[PDB]
Design a protein around this ligand. Structure first.
Ligand code: HEM
Ligand SMILES: [Zn+2]
Ligand SMILES: [Zn+2]
Lengths: 158, 158
């Protein structure tokens, strides 16, 4: 059974944001790791994996609705040059994606595709966990300054 | 500290091949899944994951060598429309990567970057296992014909 075409188009757009997030978070994670920031690697690596899981959900749903998942067109990665920039870029990506997601949810609701709607709602809740974490780290960077924040990362992980 | 420039360029090219393989194999896998081909999904899915592991190896090595991993440029996916096309496309990709690997291995060796050389040798051994499996499966589809091959798969499954 062919799904709603605009629903599939939304799912592909959202998948597109996840593909950027997977790569951006994975590269940021390994950058953190290479800098010896073990906590940040662990957090960022698991964020990347969670985005992979999201992408998989999108791919499965699109195929079920007889659409064609687009894994070809990779959007712009915004790789930061220091830890503050990297986290700010992650936050910007999450917020952009979240707005897209809320609009998509509304649309799926409007055409009674409740299964797609609810899948996207679960995903939204996940992204909001990451947004909450990011805002906390960034607040601490603001308060401490990046260099003291980084010293504390290393010292507190031990 | 900083690695050989050409080694890093090879590692980035090779990483590029892995990024295509990740997406191509993942989509192929979920296509198999959606078609109720559980065994084909399982093999293709784990191939995708192994290519992810390969990419991680490249990313970490590049960073250690103080290069910039390229996760932005994604090469051409060649997504098949039936099981035979899809598997043959996977083989083409692997064979192309395999030749790239062999060149890079010889080159890393020549500048005494044995860590990169041996990493690539291990990855190549993995790629060659996939090539082996692909040839045998393609042989079966040729022998049976794709219509009867697919009927066998579902007879045997569930
Ligand atoms: C730069 C690209 C990617 C990299 C480097 C990468 C890397 C990884 C790694 C390291 C793992 C963990 C494997 C292990 O446990 O040893 C993983 C798991 C996984 N990946 Fe990816 N991945 C990438 C892209 C993708 C994409 C695009 C998708 C889907 C569209 C995807 C789907 C998955 C899934 C479903 C898992 C298993 C999650 C779980 O159940 O634990 N990956 N990936
Ligand atoms: Zn997500
Ligand atoms: Zn590989």
């Amino acid at each position: 059974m062919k799904g709603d075409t605009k629903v599939i188009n939304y799912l592909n757009k959202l998948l597109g944001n996840e593909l950027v997030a997977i790569n951006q978070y994975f590269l940021h994670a390994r950058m953190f790791k290479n800098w010896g920031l073990k906590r940040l690697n662990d957090v960022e690596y698991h964020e990347s994996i969670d985005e992979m899981k999201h992408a998989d959900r999108y791919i499965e749903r699109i195929l079920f609705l007889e659409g064609l998942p687009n894994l070809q067109d990779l959007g712009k990665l915004n790789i930061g040059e220091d830890v503050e920039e990297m986290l700010r870029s992650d936050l910007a990506l999450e917020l952009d994606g979240a707005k897209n997601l809320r609009e998509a949810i509304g649309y799926a609701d409007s055409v009674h595709d409740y299964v797609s709607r609810d899948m996207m709602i679960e995903i939204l809740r996940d992204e909001r966990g990451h947004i909450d974490w990011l805002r906390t780290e960034l607040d601490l960077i603001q308060k401490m300054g990046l260099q003291n924040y980084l010293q504390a990362q290393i010292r507190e992980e031990g």
